Amino acid sequence: ASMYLKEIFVDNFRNLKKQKLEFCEGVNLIYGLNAQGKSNLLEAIRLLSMGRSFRGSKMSELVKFDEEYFYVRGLVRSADFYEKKIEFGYKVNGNKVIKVNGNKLKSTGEILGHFLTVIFSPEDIEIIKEGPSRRRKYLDACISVIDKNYFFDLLQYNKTLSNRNSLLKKIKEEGKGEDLLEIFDEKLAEYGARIIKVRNNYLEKLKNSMSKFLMEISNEKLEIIYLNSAGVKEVHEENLIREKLKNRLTKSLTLDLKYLSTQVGPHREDFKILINGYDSRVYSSQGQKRTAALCLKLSELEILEEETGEKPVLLLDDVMSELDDNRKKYILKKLEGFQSFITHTSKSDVEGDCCFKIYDGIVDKLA
């Protein structure tokens, strides 16, 4: 039984009026003339998956202008639940309150997995086009939805990384800190090796899944190069990678003290998408990049289902309007057995099993 959002209630959320909405199976077409309105609804849905705004927005920005809180409640059907309640509340205080079936979660990260979605947007092309930062963050979020252990390791890794970076400054002003520096190096190498091993594993699946879609769509060839920070290309034996990280951290101490940051580790790494053997960021055409962005999300979807045994809900934020007919048809074919939410400016273009009109932030069914 696939994931299915039966209902969402939004209160003081961005520009949406207070309302409870009920949805259907298959394609939920949401059309309207407002920008914020449509994608704000998608933002509220995606929030129940991730515990954050997909736009990258801070929580205080999600509260309705001049209000003191927002609140979102979804009801979801999944493999093991007829109807799970997920609640996300934020008070301008600065505390998120998140509950699943009435139990408050200790940390936001705990939300991950109760409600699976994959969100498509035209912005996904930036994952192809931009720097390592954008691709690490995409990669980290994809793996974390599947793998709680990886999420745990990344949290600790990033915590140790900032502790180390601030210690570098203390070691520069005063001296000393040699002991905490060893302790941090050891921890970075330990967490780093596990992060690298899991990343390598995911990217191998990404490569296999993405090459199939690309071959299907444009008959083009896909390769992925993972340049990891251990410089290894083996990534079986964790202790070998851990040792390579540790030695590298030791060898780069002079450079680290000059810049007051940490030059080696997975927080610096990237992966390279090759299209017909050429670097997709600097060589490929825009059409190719766009196609690659689509294959990227389709793969995400495929790996997510395969790994969790659950079939996610699909969010498509304004991704249909600039497509030609053959690409629309392809994408629609691929959403076949999912619940999906497709935002559009038009009612006619893609039909949809249920159609909703949004205006002045009220969503009404049929039109």
Author numbering: -1 to 365
What does the literature reporting this entry say, word for word?
RecF is a multifunctional protein involved in recombinant DNA repair, homologous genetic recombination, and DNA replication. Similar to RecR and RecO, RecF is a recombination mediator protein (RMP) in the RecFOR pathway for ssDNA gap repair. RecF contains the conserved Walker A motif, Walker B motif and signature motif of ABC-ATPase that exhibits ATP-dependent dimerization; additionally, the signature motif residues interact with the ATP bound to the opposite molecule. To gain insight into the mechanism of ABC-ATPase RecF, we solved the crystal structures of TTERecF, TTERecF-ATP, and TTERecF-ATPɤS.
The results of size-exclusion chromatography demonstrated that in solution, TTERecF (42 KDa) forms a monomer, whereas TTERecF-ATP (84 KDa) and TTERecF-ATPɤS (84 KDa) form a dimer. The structure of TTERecF consisted of two domains. Domain II contained six α-helices (αB, αC, αD, αE, αF, and αG) and two β-sheets (β7 and β8), in which the signature motif was the loop between β8 and αG. Domain II is similar to Lobe II subdomain of Rad50 and SMC protein; however, in the Rad50 and SMC proteins, helices corresponding to αD and αE extended into a long coiled-coil region, which was absent in TTERecF. Comparison of the structures of the ATP-free TTERecF and one monomer of the ATP-bound TTERecF dimer showed that the two monomers were similar. The root mean square deviation (r.m.s.d) was 1.015 Å under Cα trace superimposition. Notably, two structures differed in terms of their conservative Walker A motif and Walker B motif. In ATP-free TTERecF, the last turn (residues 35–38) of the helix αA in the Walker A motif occupied the ATP binding site, whereas in the binding of ATP with TTERecF, the last turn was flipped by 180° relative to the ATP-free TTERecF to create a space for ATP to further interact with TTERecF. Moreover, the helix αH of Walker B motif moved by 4 Å relative to the ATP-free TTERecF. The KD values of the TTERecF monomer interacting with the 21mer ssDNA and dsDNA were 576 nM and 1.63 µM, respectively, however, the TTERecF-ATP dimer binding 21mer ssDNA and dsDNA showed KD values of 16 nM and 6.2 nM, respectively.
